[PDB]
Design a protein around this ligand. Structure first.
Ligand code: NA
Ligand SMILES: [Zn+2]
Length: 258
């Protein structure tokens, strides 16, 4: 694709091809913890990932996605601010060239080393492509990563990255359990927003968990060895694939906790 994260095609340029970049409900945002409203009517999240079927891991030239079979209700998210059942389709990460940046959301302007996004679509719309056209079509669970102790359940992902180093490469990736990526607590903030890459559509209920997971310096190092380019093209390392925080405008971030 033409868009990317460089000097000449990065996020400050995206509005020329995708004018919704300057819309009213863009993501990510900074979560101001003292302005977020505790909402006692928000229900706990329900994460049902015991029957998840992972299929494939793909380098798509802007991140790597782990893709799941979403042809039945096997890995679903319900409850929280959601109405209805949302099926998991893929997860991916955003990360930095250094440990002090890489997350898309920030918490009181604090950046984390990386951010995991688990993407799910509302089954009332029948397929993902239809879901992205609706204001309640997607729910994305956002999880921050800080660098400290290794996360054992991430290691299977980092070990296959060698096989998808360049854009367009894919590998079989079966029997991966995404429960190994969740923090202990499911307390969260939620707001209405958008996809953070083109097409930047405003169809996302974001659910960002308060508790980060920790990963080791060696694990995040391995993300930084991937490439934005295709095989046999000049090497450009896949780092800093995050969009900066956007204006909150007329939105209220709600918290499930006090
Ligand atoms: Na994608
Ligand atoms: Zn993302």
């Amino acid at each position: 694709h033409h868009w990317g994260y460089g000097k000449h095609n990065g996020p400050e340029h995206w509005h020329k091809d995708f004018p919704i970049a300057k819309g009213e409900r863009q993501s990510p945002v900074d979560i101001d913890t003292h302005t977020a409203k505790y909402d006692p009517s928000l229900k706990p999240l329900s994460v049902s990932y015991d029957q998840a079927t992972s299929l494939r891991i793909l380098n798509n030239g802007h991140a790597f996605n782990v893709e799941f079979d979403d042809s039945q209700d096997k890995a679903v998210l319900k409850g929280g601010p959601l109405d209805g059942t949302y099926r998991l389709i893929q997860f991916h990460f955003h990360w930095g060239s250094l440990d002090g940046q890489g997350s898309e959301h920030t918490v009181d302007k604090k950046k984390y080393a990386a951010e995991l996004h688990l993407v799910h679509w509302n089954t009332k719309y029948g397929d993902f492509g239809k879901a992205v056209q609706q204001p309640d079509g997607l729910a994305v669970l956002g999880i921050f990563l800080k660098v400290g102790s290794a996360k054992p359940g991430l290691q299977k992902v980092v070990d296959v990255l060698d096989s998808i180093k360049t854009a367009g490469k894919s590998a079989d990736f079966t029997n991966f359990d995404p429960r190994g990526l969740l923090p202990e607590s499911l307390d969260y903030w939620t707001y209405p927003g958008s996809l953070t890459t083109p097409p930047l559509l405003e169809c996302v209920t974001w659910i960002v968990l308060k508790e980060p997971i920790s990963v080791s310096s060696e694990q995040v190092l391995k993300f930084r060895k991937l490439n934005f380019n295709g095989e046999g093209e000049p090497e450009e390392l896949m780092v800093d694939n995050w969009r900066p925080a956007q204006p909150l405008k007329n939105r209220q971030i709600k918290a499930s906790f006090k």
